[PDB]
């Protein structure tokens, strides 16, 4: 069995919403190190990874590493009960699946979600064994504007290294778009180990940026020449939500 208590309910719901952008069923993996989910758009281009370590959890206890399979119904069942309120989640493994207790902070009382789920064996975390040349940090607001800019003009986003700035372009025919991101306009952070240009499905960028919805935290983006793009955010109350995007070779 597994017993967990979550200090931030609002984040817990943000996470499940996130993984939704890549899958409609969700495998939660309970290891001795914590909770992790990892799923892939099934043409392999976009990856959603949720990583939540023990220490950020108010209470975490297991008999043995297990996984749980939340089918399309169970996800809808969990998300139907989502809220931005300050609340506590108590999650335990039960015989027929999971039991989730939501207890807010003001007004105190609690409703219980019974979840039907098959147990399984824990998979392990294969995180792309590449560290990328280009590195930068901004927020969700900035990425959202870009996602909707490129979409309006093309199906593909070509991200390029230029000097002291990041160049983003789209448009296949004649109608075109170029944005320049630089240090403090609007970036809080920029690092260029070496020069790089890669290309991605603009609509897989959209889906990834979309998976930042409920997170307040700043967002790290990284990429390399004809290499994948990682998009990283650390939830205010603990874990990381990560997306990777396989390039158009």
């Amino acid at each position: 069995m597994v017993k967990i208590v979550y200090p931030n309910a609002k984040d817990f719901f943000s996470f499940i919403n996130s993984i939704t952008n890549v899958t409609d069923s969700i495998i939660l993996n309970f290891t001795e190190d914590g909770i992790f989910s990892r799923h892939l758009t099934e043409d392999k281009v976009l990856m959603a990874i949720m990583r939540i370590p023990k220490d950020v959890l108010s209470e975490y206890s297991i008999d043995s590493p297990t996984s749980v399979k939340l089918d399309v119904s169970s996800v809808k069942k969990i998300l139907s009960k989502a809220s931005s309120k300050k609340a506590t989640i108590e999650l335990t493994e039960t015989d027929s699946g999971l039991k989730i207790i939501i207890r807010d902070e003001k007004s105190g009382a609690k409703s219980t979600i019974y979840i039907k789920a098959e147990k399984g064996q824990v998979e392990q975390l294969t995180e792309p064994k590449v560290n990328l040349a280009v590195n930068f940090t901004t927020d969700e607001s900035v990425l959202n504007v870009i996602a909707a800019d490129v979409t309006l003009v093309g199906e593909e986003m070509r991200i390029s290294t230029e000097e002291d700035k990041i160049k983003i372009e789209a448009g296949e025919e004649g109608k075109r778009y170029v944005a320049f991101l630089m240090k403090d306009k609007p970036l809080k952070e920029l690092s260029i180990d070496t020069s790089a240009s890669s290309s991605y499905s603009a609509e897989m960028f959209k889906d990834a940026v979309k998976g930042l919805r409920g997170f307040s935290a700043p967002t790290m983006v990284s990429f390399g020449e004809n290499l994948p793009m990682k998009i990283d955010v650390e939830a205010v109350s603990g874990g990381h939500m990560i997306f990777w995007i396989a390039p158009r070779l």
Partner: protein, 246 residues
């Protein structure tokens, strides 16, 4: 090669949104004196004429005396839909492209290849109108917005210098009086006339409230309605709407 910088992008984007209700495509006529946009709608009922003097812009430069810029209205307006409210906008051009540049919290540009838009002739402004009135753009907008959803035909008439807007719809009729007597009109002079115009065309122009604070209204019997939307730098937005079968 031309460059123009508008501070109030919002109240500029609504001007272009209003033009797009009447024209699919148009020319920017760029001169030392400013930019002009003129055209007749496909139904040949409405002629519009927008002049944005150089004063309307912050940066304003040209490489020639006369530059013709052909654009689709949907394509430009789709772009202006991405404005970010603290974005200062720049219009820019060269031999092949019109560029719209959003700059503020960060810099972004959208490119449109130039298109071949057939030139426009009025021709030629000035007949005069037996009636003239001045009023707040908002007053006009408040009134046209209510009436616009009641029927197809707007009846406008003047009596003893008071102005009357009327719609007879399938479910309701509304008639409203404006006058200087209670400041609903700022100024109002002319003869007792009467005309009627397509509500649809007239109602399209209320978005100008967002770019214009003051306006002039001209008309007469069996003659077009002239709507002059006064813009801040002696600029204007002119809408001439043909009368109905009299």
């Amino acid at each position: 090669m031309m460059k123009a910088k508008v501070i109030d992008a919002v109240s500029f984007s609504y001007i272009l949104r209003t033009v797009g209700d009447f024209l699919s495509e148009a020319n920017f006529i760029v001169t030392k004196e400013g930019i002009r946009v003129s055209g007749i709608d496909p139904s040949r009922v409405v002629f519009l004429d927008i002049f944005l003097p150089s004063s309307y812009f912050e940066g304003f430069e040209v490489s020639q005396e006369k530059e013709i810029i052909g654009f689709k209205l949907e394509d430009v307006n789709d772009i202006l839909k991405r404005v970010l409210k603290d974005d200062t906008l720049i219009l820019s051009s060269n031999e092949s492209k019109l560029t719209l540049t959003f700059d503020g919290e960060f810099t972004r540009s959208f490119e449109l290849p130039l298109i071949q838009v057939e030139s426009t002739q009025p021709p030629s402004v000035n007949l005069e109108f037996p009636f003239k009135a001045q009023l707040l753009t908002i007053t006009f907008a408040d009134i046209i917005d209510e009436l616009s959803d009641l029927g197809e035909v707007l009846n406008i008439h003047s009596k003893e210098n008071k102005l009357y807007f009327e719609v007879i719809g399938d479910l309701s009729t509304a008639k409203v009086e404006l006058s200087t007597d209670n400041g609903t009109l700022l100024e109002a002079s002319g003869a007792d006339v009467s005309s009627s115009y397509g509500m649809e065309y007239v109602a399209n122009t209320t978005k100008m409230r967002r770019a214009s604070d003051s306006m002039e209204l001209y008309f007469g019997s069996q003659i077009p309605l002239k709507l002059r939307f006064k813009l801040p730098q002696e600029g204007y937005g002119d809408f001439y709407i043909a009368p109905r079968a009299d």
